[PDB]
């Protein structure tokens, strides 16, 4: 698996233009292979909340919007997740893993 830190956001449902903070601080975000479903997943837990529970689908894409912000649409969750990183370095390894775990 692979874990990292990031502030989480979701696009606003009404206009799908503005970002709404999901976490109040940075939280752990991990790529995990679920051996019970045989699929790769991106999860982020905060307290009793599963703020990210995205299953990676071959037609999913991760966009590096800026130096420290990346995002991906998840039709199952009916939203778009946005992650803010502490550096472009972290944004990059997150993006490369997205493609790696997608490619499998």
């Amino acid at each position: 698996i692979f874990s990292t830190r990031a502030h989480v956001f979701q696009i606003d449902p009404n206009t799908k233009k503005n970002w709404v903070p999901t976490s109040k601080h940075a939280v752990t975000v991990s790529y995990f292979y679920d051996s019970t479903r045989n699929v790769y997943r991106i999860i982020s837990l905060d307290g009793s909340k599963a703020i990210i529970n995205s299953t990676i689908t071959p037609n999913m894409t991760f966009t590096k919007t800026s130096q420290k912000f990346g995002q991906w649409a998840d039709s199952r969750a009916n939203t778009v997740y946005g992650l803010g990183f502490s550096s472009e370095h972290h944004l990059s390894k997150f993006a490369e893993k997205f493609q790696e775990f997608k490619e499998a």
Binding site: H7, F9, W19, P21, T65, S66, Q67, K68, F69, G82, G84, F85
Partner: peptide, 6 residues
Amino acid sequence: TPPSPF
């Protein structure tokens, strides 16, 4: 556009 300062 991303949330600041990202």
